[PDB]
Amino acid sequence: QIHSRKMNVSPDVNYEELARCTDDFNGAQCKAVCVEAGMIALRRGATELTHEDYMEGILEVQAKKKANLQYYA
Amino acid sequence: MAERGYSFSLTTFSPSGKLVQIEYALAAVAGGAPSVGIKAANGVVLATEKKQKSILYDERSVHKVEPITKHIGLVYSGMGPDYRVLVHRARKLAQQYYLVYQEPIPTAQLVQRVASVMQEYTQSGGVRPFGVSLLICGWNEGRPYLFQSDPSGAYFAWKATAMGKNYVNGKTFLEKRYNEDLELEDAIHTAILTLKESFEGQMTEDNIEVGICNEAGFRRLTPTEVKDYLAAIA
Amino acid sequence: RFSPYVFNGGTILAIAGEDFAIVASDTRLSEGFSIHTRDSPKCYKLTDKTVIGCSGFHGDCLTLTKIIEARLKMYKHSNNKAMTTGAIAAMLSTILYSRRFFPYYVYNIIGGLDEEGKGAVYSFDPVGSYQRDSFKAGGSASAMLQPLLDNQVGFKNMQNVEHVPLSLDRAMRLVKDVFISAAERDVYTGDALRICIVTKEGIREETVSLRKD
Amino acid sequence: MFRNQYDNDVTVWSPQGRIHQIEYAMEAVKQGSATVGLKSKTHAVLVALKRAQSELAAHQKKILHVDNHIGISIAGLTADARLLCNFMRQECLDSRFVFDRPLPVSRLVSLIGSKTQIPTQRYGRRPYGVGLLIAGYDDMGPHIFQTCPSANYFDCRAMSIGARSQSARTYLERHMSEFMECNLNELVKHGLRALRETLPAEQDLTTKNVSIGIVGKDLEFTIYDDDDVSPFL
Amino acid sequence: GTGYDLSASTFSPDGRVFQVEYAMKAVENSSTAIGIRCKDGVVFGVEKLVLSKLYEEGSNKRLFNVDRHVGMAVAGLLADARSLADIAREEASNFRSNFGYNIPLKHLADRVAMYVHAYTLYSAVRPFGCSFMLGSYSVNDGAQLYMIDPSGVSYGYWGCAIGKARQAAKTEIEKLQMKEMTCRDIVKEVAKIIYIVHDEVKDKAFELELSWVGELTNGRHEIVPKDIREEAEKYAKESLKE
């Protein structure tokens, strides 16, 4: 919330779900996701940062958060 | 596990063509307190040194010569616990096989059994071979006697040999002094001298253990008896 | 030593339509000269328009029945699909062929309806074996009742002038009449009579009581 | 480093005492399909998404009829699940033969757990990487349990598995009080909504993927499949 | 590489293995349980942290029974504790029928002690990471309390406690009476200790759980819920708010 004050925000932000999903992060790495979410946001053309940008951002490697799909038929 | 572990052995062929673990056991042997053997032909003498290192002891408690049978005896150089265990299994095998039959034990057959147990452990893993070398001493009739058994699994006949610390040096002394006809009393004098030459920390009637195979096989010497020989020639 | 064979069987009668079947049974169960119980049938509804009856000994009868029921449940789990009558017919036999070493036995019969819009009844021997029926009486009193049953219901012997085709109603009258008659000729028949009537609507039960003395 | 070390030991213990194997197992649950579980505690429903790999296929089932009073949804790989399911059916069969009782699903679930846990407690066994939402209608009502391949057994009044589980959880907590001990219809609507939360939400609702399964006071195991959910939509 | 995380069937330059120390770190990493023994019986109490409202307890707790005269509580991982325990009751039961006696507390311990030490000698089966607190009232011997550690160490106690709080709890406990009044009085007292302990643990709610083996229970193992739990709670709420 403190870091996001510089950043342009759409009005709802649902930090609690995000905070929980995030795991084993140091103080810099959480900050890292935020700036990054703004970079993702830049690619969209979106002028306001929204929930979805963050979700992609944490999923990215920086404490070995990763995902893969295919383990279903 | 309970059947998992190392199926193949610690010992392994080398591009040397030597067996590493085997090499180490000659070292393991090396550390042993001084041992000798003299074959008096009609008799046999085996002797060794009890080092002593704690004044706190009792009796003459554990030995380093134990009777397998009433006719053959073992003495060794290498690791003591291994020795106790080695004697137990063999001792069990000697009695069982030669009470099926009523014939008394042939020497070679004991050697064949000790070597196999040593060899199976070389073949298999999980367990390591024993790191002892034995002198199999017996008497029976007019047969040859005094035999040596390696941690290697090999056997040889000898007239005389030596073990323990500085084995090569003692054997060279032994080689020169030991010749022709001798007596059972005479063989004892020599063995004490050869042990003294290897090292004397001291010799008392409790640094020495001497046993012979002569009248009706293995007989254990009294402490006084040996002491008579020490005076007979120091 | 102790027995490896005890009798307990009753008497039953299975009658096959061509779109219905009825399987009827006494409730009286006896062995010899002492009476085990004055109640209980050996005919049961397995379900889905399959009716089954196991005559021979009560101890065996409950056990087979329970056991079959799981094989049917398991089968449906294994992929949706059910045993037909015929399937069940093979399944009982394998069990029996195993039991040929076991010293207790039973005389089993299965009845139900096909999807050919008619009855099938298959009857087994107490060693294994199967045969196609038209009509079967099973149990003790069977041997005496059956030639007459065969003739009155059937008209398929070489000793009758005519045929008539079955009717349900008519089958019910004949069945009661045979049982009421059976009773003063046995001490294995009596008390009450339990009728399982099998139709394509569903399974109905009727009970009527009989004489005793 | 030592990532390979921690795979190589199934007896693993680290300075922080973590067991990575469990961790891996959790990522595998998140890889699976989307499933929700809901109960009023007089009816229980589960909306489950059944998906298809490509256009010319048709969806694979993830709702399994374990018994005619108990059932599950699977979320994770199909192959392991089949193996577990035979053991549990046979455990139900002997209950019926010997005892002639259904047996508490609570009691059942606990037993299955042990037999898995003990092989993690020694050499061999990789994680099974399927999580389950297990439903059943027992003597004291329906009950809902989450079985994990961490053998973490918990009874919940509703739960969810699938990536973005948390989303739907938060809605379930919000609507939680509305669920009460009635209405069939209401539970399903909330489920359809909730299920939308689990998905990326760019994918629009479809009747071929969804599947609705109910068990309740006089109900046993029934599945609504394809089009059949439209009546109740 | 230390060369001995790999093993668990060997010696190290620290003697025992690193794996065994780690198991000891993990119990302390868990929640918090205490036990107080008295001359009339023995009381167990445990703190459980609340997660969220969806959940509910109905077979997963932290208080566990042994047999039908033995009380059992644990710190560490739930699933593994339950696995140890099911076997213990069963082992106890075969005894119970066979010798015809209702097992001692002391004999049960010995049986568990031996199991854990055997697993330290091998590398086949990784150890449990639990610590188990057991005890009851024996009709002719008294109350006896034991605690078994994953460290292959077990003793008889007047008090024992485990969890993050351990050091601190034992201090307060240490302050109190040997006799400690009557059992009933202790139910209230243990509740103050937990009540106060939670200010130190507070990040979310807790639920207070108490149990007993009492002279009034006649040596059987029962939970203390009901009005009885609530009064002890009121008394803590009055005294301080922490």
Added chain:
Amino acid sequence: RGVNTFSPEGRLFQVEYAIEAIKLGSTAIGIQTSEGVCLAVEKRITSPLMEPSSIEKIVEIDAHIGCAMSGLIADAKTLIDKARVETQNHWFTYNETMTVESVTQAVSNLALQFGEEDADPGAMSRPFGVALLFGGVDEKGPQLFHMDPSGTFVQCDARAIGSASEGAQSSLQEVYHKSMTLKEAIKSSLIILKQVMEEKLNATNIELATVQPGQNFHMFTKEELEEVIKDI
């Protein structure tokens, strides 16, 4: 470095590798239409001193279920022996017909035995490297399933597997229709099979079979294949 490992991803290593092995084999094609299932294959050839007359890779499991297999060919020889027997056992027990699907499940149980660990009972150290397209006809009509080396089965109506699969499946879409003539299909199949090839189109490297209700499982003969060539 265990292969008893689950993998940190949690996506087992060995299964993934198998798909690569498959990309190296031939191309096998299936279209099931409204009535009938067709399976077409490339059995290939290379040298003139070879007899592929001998070779095959499309087998009839029974006269009402067939399978085409693709991948490490020796494994599939093991795979079929188990299946074929299991089907036959059901005929001893109930003298009745098995579903294509029931047969496919039975074989998938056997797909999991890899390892010597305690998630799988050992016999094998690794899995079968093959996918199969399982066809049959029953009361649920002609159906097709794709047996996935991932020890799982998915249902299908049209599928290609093979090296060319990525392209082929795309090509398969335009020509597929929910209703299309069986004979028409065979021509459509032939077109995709032609496209993949670099080597000559002859009746001595490609093989067709179909199952129709009116004549059982039938393997298509050379003379028949040559006629199909003439039409397109």
Added chain:
Amino acid sequence: SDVGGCKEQIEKLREVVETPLLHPERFVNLGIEPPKGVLLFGPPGTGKTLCARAVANRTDACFIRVIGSELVQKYVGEGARMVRELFEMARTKKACLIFFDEIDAIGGARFDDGAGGDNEVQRTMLELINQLDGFDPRGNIKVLMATNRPDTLDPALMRPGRLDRKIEFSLPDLEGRTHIFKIHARSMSVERDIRFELLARLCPNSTGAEIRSVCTEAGMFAIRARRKIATEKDFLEAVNKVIKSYAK
């Protein structure tokens, strides 16, 4: 020159390096600051290497190449001195790229804390961290790191607030291979009536470097044949050698 499976790596590298220098004023309005370093891994000379030069030419900022292995010295304290010197120069010029060639020599492996001059190399590794995490700020300075397998490297080197994006290489899809072949076919005399993609599906899946190499092999056979145009025949031959060459 190897784009096709190097395609993803290009797309991201432009966004990280080029875009901040081209349009900085935009990033400020938003209130976002871009990373300072990106990481390259996989085999060199496959276009992992090319990619760093290819952006260097496009981006128009000086490409400064330091070989970490060289920085290593015979006598202590010198090594730190070097690290420091590099950073002072880097600061002055603002907008520059520091290309680190296979930092693993003084890149991580290492946590053991000495055992005999594993300390001296560790001191350099730690000194770099000080400058990065320190009071300096990024500026317009960009860092490209080169590792074999990224695994080697230590958690300190990995950690955010210096390393954030790790740009990867990959097994190239079939379509991709064709683009690389397409690049090659302008120089190489061909006859287009045959199509390389069909062969390529049949050929082993392999990264970009082997794909150019088989082509290169193909021209030779022509030259022996005494033909000036490519042929279908040449292509068949190349696969047998190449399949052998990885396995030595």
Added chain:
Amino acid sequence: GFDRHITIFSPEGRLYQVEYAFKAINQGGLTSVAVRGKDCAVIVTQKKVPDKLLDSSTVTHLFKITENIGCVMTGMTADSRSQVQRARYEAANWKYKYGYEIPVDMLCKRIADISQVYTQNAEMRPLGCCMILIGIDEEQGPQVYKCDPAGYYCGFKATAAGVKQTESTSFLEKKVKKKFDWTFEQTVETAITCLSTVLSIDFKPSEIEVGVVTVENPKFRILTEAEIDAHLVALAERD
């Protein structure tokens, strides 16, 4: 060599791992001593606790192995307790089978063989403990045998345990010239005295735990306070 997941023969002549068992065999500060007379054999140990939330009426490190035999253990607690249980079964069995009493020495030798095998396995380690056996035989009189877990055991004229063994040894030798001049109790007194000098603690009634074996009785008993205080008082009078 490679101690890492196997143990082999080395030029070291011992094993790093065997030495490590010798080295840390106590993780507390207890020390023990044992002396042998022809009037008694006494083992003197300590009682110590860290707090008083713990009981001390079940805490002990002296074990009654059987009526005649007594055993004090120096070792890791887990390992000491295991070994006792194993021994208890083996003794009992020896009584059943032979019908005659198990010699003290015989047990030490049997146990020693069990230690030794584990030394051959590179899939299992030996238990970490030194076991001192004490007893009263009618076949040589009282007997005092110490084991070490190398497979080594021997009988001694007296011995000491804890980490300060060598220091205790020096007192012991001085004493051991004359020890057949001590009567019953005076054995006990000297025995207290040599632990008090090493350890540098003038004992207290709840810090000490003397165990005595008594000749002409098959008793092993830990002494009552009155007797233990009577001795303690006895050394004051000579100070």
